[PDB]
Amino acid sequence: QYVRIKNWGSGEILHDTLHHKATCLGSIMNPKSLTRGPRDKPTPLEELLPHAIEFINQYYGSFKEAKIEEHLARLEAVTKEIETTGTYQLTLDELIFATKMAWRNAPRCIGRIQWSNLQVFDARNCSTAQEMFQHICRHILYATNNGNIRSAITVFPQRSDGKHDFRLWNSQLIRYAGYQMPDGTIRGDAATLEFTQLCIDLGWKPRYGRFDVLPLVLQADGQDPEVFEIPPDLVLEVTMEHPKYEWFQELGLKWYALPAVANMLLEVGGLEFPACPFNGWYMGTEIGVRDFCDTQRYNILEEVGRRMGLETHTLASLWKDRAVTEINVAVLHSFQKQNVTIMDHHTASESFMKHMQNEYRARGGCPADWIWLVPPVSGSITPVFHQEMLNYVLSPFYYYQIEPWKTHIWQN
Amino acid sequence: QYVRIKNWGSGEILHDTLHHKATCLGSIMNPKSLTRGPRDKPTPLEELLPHAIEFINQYYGSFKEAKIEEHLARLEAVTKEIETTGTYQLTLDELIFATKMAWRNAPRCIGRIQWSNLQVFDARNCSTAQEMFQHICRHILYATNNGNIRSAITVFPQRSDGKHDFRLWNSQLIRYAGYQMPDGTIRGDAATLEFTQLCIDLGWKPRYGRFDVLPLVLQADGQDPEVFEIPPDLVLEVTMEHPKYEWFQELGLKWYALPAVANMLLEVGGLEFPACPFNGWYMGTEIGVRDFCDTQRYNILEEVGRRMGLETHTLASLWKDRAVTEINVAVLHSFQKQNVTIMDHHTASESFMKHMQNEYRARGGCPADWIWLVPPVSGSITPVFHQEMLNYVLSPFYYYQIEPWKTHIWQN
Numbered sequence: 001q002y003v004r005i006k007n008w009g010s011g012e013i014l015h016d017t018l019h020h021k022a023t024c025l026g027s028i029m030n031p032k033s034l035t036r037g038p039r040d041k042p043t044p045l046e047e048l049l050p051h052a053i054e055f056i057n058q059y060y061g062s063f064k065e066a067k068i069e070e071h072l073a074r075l076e077a078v079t080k081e082i083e084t085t086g087t088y089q090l091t092l093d094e095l096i097f098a099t100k101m102a103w104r105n106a107p108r109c110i111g112r113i114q115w116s117n118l119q120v121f122d123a124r125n126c127s128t129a130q131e132m133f134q135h136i137c138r139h140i141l142y143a144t145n146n147g148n149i150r151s152a153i154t155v156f157p158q159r160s161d162g163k164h165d166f167r168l169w170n171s172q173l174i175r176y177a178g179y180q181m182p183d184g185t186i187r188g189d190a191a192t193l194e195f196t197q198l199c200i201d202l203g204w205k206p207r208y209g210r211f212d213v214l215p216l217v218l219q220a221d222g223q224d225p226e227v228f229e230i231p232p233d234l235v236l237e238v239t240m241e242h243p244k245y246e247w248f249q250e251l252g253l254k255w256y257a258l259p260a261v262a263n264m265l266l267e268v269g270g271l272e273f274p275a276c277p278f279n280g281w282y283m284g285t286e287i288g289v290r291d292f293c294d295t296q297r298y299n300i301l302e303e304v305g306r307r308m309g310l311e312t313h314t315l316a317s318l319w320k321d322r323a324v325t326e327i328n329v330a331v332l333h334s335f336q337k338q339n340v341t342i343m344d345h346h347t348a349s350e351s352f353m354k355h356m357q358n359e360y361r362a363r364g365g366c367p368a369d370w371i372w373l374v375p376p377v378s379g380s381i382t383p384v385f386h387q388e389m390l391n392y393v394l395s396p397f398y399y400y401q402i403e404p405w406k407t408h409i410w411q412n
Numbered sequence: 413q414y415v416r417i418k419n420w421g422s423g424e425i426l427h428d429t430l431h432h433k434a435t436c437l438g439s440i441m442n443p444k445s446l447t448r449g450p451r452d453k454p455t456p457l458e459e460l461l462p463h464a465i466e467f468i469n470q471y472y473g474s475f476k477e478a479k480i481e482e483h484l485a486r487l488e489a490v491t492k493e494i495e496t497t498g499t500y501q502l503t504l505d506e507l508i509f510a511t512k513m514a515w516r517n518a519p520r521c522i523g524r525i526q527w528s529n530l531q532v533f534d535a536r537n538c539s540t541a542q543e544m545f546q547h548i549c550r551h552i553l554y555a556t557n558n559g560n561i562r563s564a565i566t567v568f569p570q571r572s573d574g575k576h577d578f579r580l581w582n583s584q585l586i587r588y589a590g591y592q593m594p595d596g597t598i599r600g601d602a603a604t605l606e607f608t609q610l611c612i613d614l615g616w617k618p619r620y621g622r623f624d625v626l627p628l629v630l631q632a633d634g635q636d637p638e639v640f641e642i643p644p645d646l647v648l649e650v651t652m653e654h655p656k657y658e659w660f661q662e663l664g665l666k667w668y669a670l671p672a673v674a675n676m677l678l679e680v681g682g683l684e685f686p687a688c689p690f691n692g693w694y695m696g697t698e699i700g701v702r703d704f705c706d707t708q709r710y711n712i713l714e715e716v717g718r719r720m721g722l723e724t725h726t727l728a729s730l731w732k733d734r735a736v737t738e739i740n741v742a743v744l745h746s747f748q749k750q751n752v753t754i755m756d757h758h759t760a761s762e763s764f765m766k767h768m769q770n771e772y773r774a775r776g777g778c779p780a781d782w783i784w785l786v787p788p789v790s791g792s793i794t795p796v797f798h799q800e801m802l803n804y805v806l807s808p809f810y811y812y813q814i815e816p817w818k819t820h821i822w823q824n
């Protein structure tokens with residue numbers, strides 16, 4: 001009937017029924033269950049129609065006051081379109097509803113309380129890489145909003161036969177380059193070494209800097225990817241300063257204000273959109289902990305430790321715990337001072353708890369991935385840590401995809 | 413053939429084959445798969461014998477230089493014993509091997525690098541509650557070792573028909589009481605309110621203190637549980653002090669030095685031991701973060717915040733991150749100063765990584781529960797966070813049990 005869920009902090013119990021509408025490798029980053037790969041043929045009609053009907057029923061079923069006639073008419077119209085064209089086009093309202101539901105159904109997102117607040121850019125009529133670039137620049141500009149970050153998503157043309165896929169090769173819209181310097185050292189973001197090289201191979205000019213914004217590698221209509229530099233005026237950045245440590249600024253650190261996922265696929269009513277970049281606003285720890293403190297990234301932990309005069313040669317001293325916190329304080333302080341939207345992990349965590357509570361009352365469940373929802377620092381200090389969660393895949397959904405460079409058949 | 417596992421920090425890859433020897437509710441605390449319940453009849457022979465043979469093969473297969481004749485003789489002897497008695501007794505060496513393997517197979521234990529270092533107390537001949545108490549006191553004394561903590565396990569009589577089970581009703585050997593005071597406030601450990609009341613119902617005298625060591629509630633031969641106060645001389649405690657904050661001592665905090673799990677069941681070769689308390693040594697965060705900072709426990713976070721002069725009314729200030737770290741420092745500092753064994757979470761985490769590496773080479777796998785292995789603070793700062801893990805149940809294994817008070821048929 002339902003799955004019992006308990007919060008070991010408040011003792012509160014919840015009943016999950018939503019998992020029934022779903023379609024031990026728990027700590028796996030990219031499991032097949034969260035990946036929707038490529039195709040070389042259109043979706044079989046026997047599979048498409050049922051999914052299409054289901055979504056249309058879900059859409060019309062979401063209205064406060066039902067509109068039965070429109071519901072029947074749409075069901076009929078969709079079927080006919082599938083029979084006559086082999087697929088169908090979602091109405092703008094349906095697409096908007098789908099993008100919000102997919103966000104609402106994202107198990108790895110802690111910011112889901114904001115799910116109903118999403119700007120949707122319909123770029124389904126797009127046809128060239130240049131046009132993609134223009135849509136993306138428009139998105140970046142709208143979302144950035146001079147620091148007052150706004151959530152948005154740009155929907156490109158849906159997959160037809162799988163041979164004409166629109167794809168953004170970048171993992172994120174804004175990301176820094178990584179360079180393997182002559183002296184053997186690594187400059188910039190060590191995690192983008194391979195992708196940076198790819199950009200260089202495609203004609204992009206390497207600037208050998210610590211924070212060089214990578215260009216957009218855009219694939220349109222299944223054709224070879226084209227490189228486009230993002231106009232610097234569109235990239236808002238925050239310079240890192242500490243409210244007490246004047247020497248923090250001497251580290252010369254900065255980060256971009258816009259967190260935008262660029263390579264995921266939107267699945268809805270049998271349709272697949274291989275290109276649908278979206279963004280929200282940053283949670284402090286993403287920058288302060290992952291970007292700055294992961295060893296395979298900027299790895300600034302030890303340097304910050306020394307400057308604080310900490311016993312960096314004795315792990316038991318907990319110097320790492322002290323350093324990471326000052327870096328997190330720097331990130332939040334800098335964004336706030338520069339009037340750029342950002343949320344700390346404690347506030348975000350409480351926000352998600354409220355959302356989860358809302359979801360269980362509204363639809364009897366909330367797909368959630370504990371491993372991703374608990375922040376990279378102060379785990380049990382946040383309420384999410386004490387909350388039992390059920391991880392399942394619904395529809396609409398935002399899936400991962402196989403890296404484009406691994407399945408792309410080059411034309412030259 | 414094997415399951416591919418990746419460390420997203422070092423990029424290292426590992427192949428898991430051990431999961432084949434195994435017998436999404438990932439964040440569930442007490443799932444049925446980790447619980448081994450009660451019975452009212454002996455284990456069916458058709459089930460027992462196969463498991464017994466398997467274990468005997470595993471035991472003899474662990475020797476560097478094989479002893480084929482002894483192996484065959486033991487296999488024959490065990491079968492005959494099962495046919496003539498309906499069960500069998502493990503040799504002391506087999507039991508020792510089983511306890512270490514079960515520890516080695518504990519997915520939720522970060523201290524497994526120490527798996528081969530375990531003192532085993534054979535109490536299989538025990539028959540009364542008084543005798544249980546004496547064995548437990550002996551265990552506590554040996555393990556405590558005047559601060560130089562030693563890992564040990566006491567094995568009580570195996571389950572026969574399930575009606576004569578030896579059980580320790582306590583979750584841990586040493587634990588503090590919780591009292592619902594007259595003024596409505598809670599004194600002591602809020603998490604032991606119900607169990608404390610049970611002890612009181614059984615005749616134990618409540619001392620209404622903040623740190624009152626709970627008595628042992630012992631069940632022997634399936635009979636009603638008897639209460640036994642632990643002699644204070646056997647309970648080593650550490651008074652909490654901060655290396656810089658003289659006011660920390662004013663909080664009047666302390667904690668016991670001995671971490672001992674008391675209510676789990678040891679499964680091995682078809683046999684079940686409902687009573688087998690074991691202990692290792694503490695990892696700082698257990699006390700500093702869970703015991704002291706969980707809201708449903710001692711909840712000292714805000715008080716420590718104020719005393720540090722922090723902005724405790726502004727979450728974004730990250731005051732909680734600053735407070736929890738000073739508490740962790742206090743715990744480690746206090747244990748070290750009082751010469752009581754303890755390990756910080758960073759060192760423990762690195763220790764487990766080394767162990768995992770050792771296990772994959774030795775037997776092609778290491779069952780691990782990411783959700784429990786990643787410390788309650790500084791998650792991504794530890795290497796375990798970046799390690800993909802596979803969680804599976806092998807044999808021998810340490811299982812949870814249904815709370816005794818829920819299935820016990822009282823004789824009076």
Ligand code: HEM
Nearest residue numbers: 103106108109110111114151153278279280281282283398
């Ligand atoms: C409004 C503010 C938002 C906040 C603060 C927020 C925060 C986060 C954070 C912290 C993550 C983890 C990122 C990582 O560790 O890689 C995440 C993941 C995710 N978010 Fe949100 N989010 C927001 C908006 C959105 C929006 C607008 C969408 C979609 C329309 C969305 C979709 C997702 C998805 C699908 C993931 C998983 C990405 C992956 O698996 O790599 N989020 N979000």
Ligand code: HEM
Nearest residue numbers: 515518520521522523526563565690691692693694695810
């Ligand atoms: C030598 C030092 C040891 C250290 C530092 C260590 C540390 C830990 C820690 C931190 C936990 C988590 C406790 C919790 O969150 O509830 C744990 C769990 C566990 N440990 Fe170890 N351990 C050690 C020795 C042992 C020994 C000697 C055994 C068994 C013979 C063992 C068996 C287990 C088991 C089965 C669990 C899971 C308990 C549960 O699920 O509640 N550990 N250990």
Ligand SMILES: CCOC(=O)N1CCC(Nc2cc(C)ccn2)CC1
Nearest residue numbers: 172259260261278279280281282286
């Ligand atoms: C390692 C580079 O990471 C990133 O560029 N990002 C981290 C991952 C991802 N974060 C996000 C995404 C969204 C949509 C909202 C808040 N936070 C996008 C930004």
Ligand SMILES: CCOC(=O)N1CCC(Nc2cc(C)ccn2)CC1
Nearest residue numbers: 584671672673690691692693694698
């Ligand atoms: C909430 C009370 O918790 C406890 O008494 N403990 C916490 C849970 C458990 N910890 C342990 C156990 C072992 C065997 C080794 C290290 N640490 C036993 C002690």
Ligand SMILES: C[C@H](O)[C@H](O)[C@H]1CNc2nc(N)[nH]c(=O)c2N1N=O
Nearest residue numbers: 027028029371372373797798799800
């Ligand atoms: C191995 C493990 O799955 C991986 O390190 C995880 C852990 N948690 C997590 N949370 C978020 N929000 N983002 C992430 O990328 C990860 N993963 N790690 O990097």
Ligand SMILES: C[C@H](O)[C@H](O)[C@H]1CNc2nc(N)[nH]c(=O)c2N1N=O
Nearest residue numbers: 385386387388439440441783784785
């Ligand atoms: C809900 C979740 O499973 C629970 O809060 C967990 C999380 N992790 C964890 N690790 C250890 N080592 N011990 C634990 O008890 C827990 N759980 N929580 O208390």
